[model samples]
Target chain A: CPLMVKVLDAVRGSPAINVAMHVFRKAADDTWEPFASGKTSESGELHGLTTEEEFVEGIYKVEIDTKSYWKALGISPFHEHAEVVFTANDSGPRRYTIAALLSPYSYSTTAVVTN
Target chain B: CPLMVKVLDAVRGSPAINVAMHVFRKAADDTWEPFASGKTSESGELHGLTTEEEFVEGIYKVEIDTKSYWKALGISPFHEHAEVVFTANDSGPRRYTIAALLSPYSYSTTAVVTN
Candidate 1:
């Protein structure tokens, strides 16, 4: 896959199922144009987000609807949303994987890249 | 605890065992002054990194020796090190928990925070 996403619930120590999220490509005018959106799966992973042809070189943002995920579990979270921003496919046609850990008060993310 | 660290092996879906990491505070002269260091435990947790007094308001950098970890398992990784950078306790003293997910070709982190 060219890109992959997975999320974990750090507190419960499980996959964060059904968390809503969106992927946006930054446009020339500095606007975020929607590219993809989905809810996490039982494994806390989202697949088939984009293809090599559609996912071109550009600035991209993956915004996870963190607040609602926690609210549904009756816990309030710290961030309105959790987001990761970066440029993609710049150096080469690289493969990227993003993973996030979520808690009521905090979130962390890391990326792994390969050509 | 005021601060905590945990690590997970995303590919294997288990706690990342014995991954070494360090914590550094940004000094006034813009150097990274060492604060604490530890290896992940059986539960992939590091505790008692600092007291409320020792861990004052400052920019912090947590660098994990990712390459060495993967290399030991006979796998080459993309990043030399996996690091997270942020300013802490700027608005107020807060408790923070950082969790990271690791893979041979990918890494991800999340933070949990509270006052």
Candidate 2:
């Protein structure tokens, strides 16, 4: 099954933005391992930060470098990192959209399965 | 004090990747306000995702769209969003770095004052 994860920076209301990302899944050892990783594009998005492999039913984690984004703007950030965790059960191709809105003090996010 | 936050995807160990980002600071009303927003570059980084204005001593937040990045890779992510929050105590230009490592199920982050 193919799984898709999408990220959007809501403050700009634009798809083009800079960000660093990494993906991982739970292992049988009860530890997490990084399977894939990368950055966003001029479109302010990445289709798959992780490499495609045999799908397994387990917990997944998405980590973002929020501090890097703020540093580019020449401002000090309070938060160190932002993380999102979800699960993959369907063995087929599945798409997940993670939308985030944030500030120095607070942030909100929503996830949906599309297609 | 100029705050600079840098992000890296540990999985690929590469800086060039796609990502969407937004920045915000805490306002007087105890509300989070979006000050700057954008995406990372081919270097897998954003210098300052927010607009450069007079520095204020308050809480700052960095939000990244992790789901979108994974979606591009064709993998459904368990996490819907990732967020980092920090505080700016100095009125001058200060730099802070937020580094993150993530997987589908686990993640870790560290914050440091660079300059």
Candidate 3:
């Protein structure tokens, strides 16, 4: 099962907010690159767009845009954005994807890798 | 408040496991690219290595190595890895970082952007 979290109160002046995601491979030198990306629509929810590739065996990171998303909604945001950083390893031919649900108050995410 | 999740039971057959993270900007075409990255040590916890850059104002993704981590522990992982994805908005020069507390069975992430 994949693990994910949501950014609350992302927008600026409105009640709406946005959610996004990133996946990647860990470099030997302690650096990271992009693999796959995901985000919620104007509806402020991620229900249909799940499942992604980009998640290879190695290290990766994920972040969200809280302030801008909230600003777009015309709501005053308290925080700029929220973020999460973690690592992954793939010994075999496996695939995985993560999805997050967002709002101005709460959210959550899950990571799923295929065997 | 940044958001993050941990990959429980990563690796194979051993108590040791790895973790990784990814950050990126949403392209005009709805795609994503490289940004910032983070990861955990064989200890399977994300602590000392928390704050990071690469998390710009946009959508991002975060994934963890669950199976591999668990495998390293010489344990059979029920899942491959965990994941979390969210969006961020930079309405100002505020910057924030998200960190997750991960173990072999549980974890959590928080998103925080500068305001």
DockQ of every predicted complex: 0.06, 0.17, 0.07
Off by over 4 Å in 2: A1-115, B50-53, B90-93
Best by DockQ: 2
Residue A108 Cα positional deviation in candidate 1, in Å, after optimal superposition: 0.5
Clashes (backbone N, CA, C under 3 Å), per candidate, total 10, 75, 93
- Which scores better on DockQ, 1 or 2? 2
Specify the poorest-scoring 10-residue window by lDDT in model 1 chain B: B106-115
Q: Which rank order by TM-score, best down to worst?
A: 1, 2, 3
Worst 10 residues of 3 chain A by lDDT: A6-15
Candidate 1 lDDT by residue in tens digits, A1-115:
7888988888775688899999999999999999999999987899989888887889999999999999999997889999999999576667787878788888877776644
Which lDDT tens digits does candidate 3 get at residues B1-115? Answer: 2433333332233323355655555677877765555665565444432243533466555555545645665665433455445555445334445444334444444545555
Best by lDDT: 1
Better of 1 and 3 by TM-score: 1
Ranking by DockQ: 2, 3, 1
Model 3: CA > 4 A from native: A1-115, B1-18, B41-55, B103-106
lDDT of 2 by residue, A9-67 (tens): 44566552667878788899968899667777776566655433555667788777777
Error of 3 at B86 (Å): 2.1
RMSD of each: 12.3, 15.5, 10.1
Candidate 3 has a DockQ of: 0.07
Question: Per-residue lDDT tens digits of candidate 1, residues B1-115?
Answer: 7789888776655567788999999999999999999998887788989998777888999999988888888888899989999888687677888877788777777776744
